[PDB]
Amino acid sequence: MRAKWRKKRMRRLKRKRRKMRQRS
Amino acid sequence: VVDPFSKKDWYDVKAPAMFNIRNIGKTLVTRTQGTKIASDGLKGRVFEVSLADLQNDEVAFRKFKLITEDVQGKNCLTNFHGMDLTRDKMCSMVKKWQTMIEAHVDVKTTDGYLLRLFCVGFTKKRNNQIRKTSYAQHQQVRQIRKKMMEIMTREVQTNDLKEVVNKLIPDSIGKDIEKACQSIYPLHDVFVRKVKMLKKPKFELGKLMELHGE
């Protein structure tokens, strides 16, 4: 994990999490 | 197959007869052939003629450009239209740790020629001076620039294109500005950076013939 692209992956895991809660 | 060096003819260029060398060069031009005009085609041409070959004992870093006005048979006439000091001189007198002052002004002469004059000044470090920098304050630069504004207006507005070009040939305006500015700050490299026109009156054969025959 490079610092920035770990941050990008965490953001993209967060965006997927938000859509799951929205549909539920 | 056909070489275009025969379908054209050469004319000799003559500047106004107020310089030292009238002959400048021979410029080829196409024949009329019943469609185009060689006189109108040669009109609007501009030959750049420095003072090195325009005179014989003048500076070699002042370029004079001349606009054609009329054609007399095999002859081609010209007229001063603008000037610019060489950029190889330009880059050489600008150095480090010094100050430059510009001033641009538009002045119209009585003949109807609108002229935009640029003047350039540089602060002079004295012989004994030892300080690394020689800056002039914003307040001194503004009044120095105003001085070049007023001096150039006086020396151009009241003089014709005849007189103004005769004044710029020895660069007397650049020396006058430097000496007058020695009161506030003596200056070392002072000349006129550029002179360009903006408008012209109606072209007249009488004026051009008078200039070329005087």
């Binding site: - | 060096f5 050469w10 410029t27 080829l28 501009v46 420095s50």
Partner: protein, 133 residues
């Protein structure tokens, strides 16, 4: 050619546009409105690689000298240009060799100028700003 005495010289202006890819030597009358010739390093060599090499520039310069000697023009002033504008202010390698041949061929060369376009500040410069190759 013009009808002039042997004691005088046929004068004209010459521009040497120098770049790192292809040098350009071009000769016209004083004003430049009428045109005498143009030779470059491109027409010299089959490969586009050596358009900027000195050897092709000398062969191109000899092309200027012989074809302009045929017309009847001998004396030429020089005005130098780099790529100019935004690109480098430094003339490329194809300037020394081309000027060497046009001096060895016997043509007269007098005043020298630099009329490279030097902006107060031109617009944004191609490339972008990051990474190389």
């Amino acid at each position: 050619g013009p009808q002039v005495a042997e004691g005088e010289n046929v004068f004209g202006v010459c521009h040497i546009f120098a770049s790192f890819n292809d040098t350009f030597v071009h000769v016209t009358d004083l004003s430049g409105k009428e045109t005498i010739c143009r030779v470059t390093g491109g027409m010299k060599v089959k490969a586009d690689r050596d358009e900027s090499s000195p050897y092709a520039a000398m062969l191109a310069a000899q092309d200027v000298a012989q074809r302009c000697k045929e017309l009847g023009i001998t004396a030429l002033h020089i005005k130098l240009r780099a790529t100019g504008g935004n690109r480098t202010k430094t003339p490329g390698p194809g300037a020394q060799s081309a000027l060497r041949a046009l001096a060895r061929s016997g043509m007269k060369i007098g005043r020298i100028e630099d009329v490279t376009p030097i902006p107060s500040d031109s617009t944004r410069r191609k490339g972008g700003r990051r990474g190389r190759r």
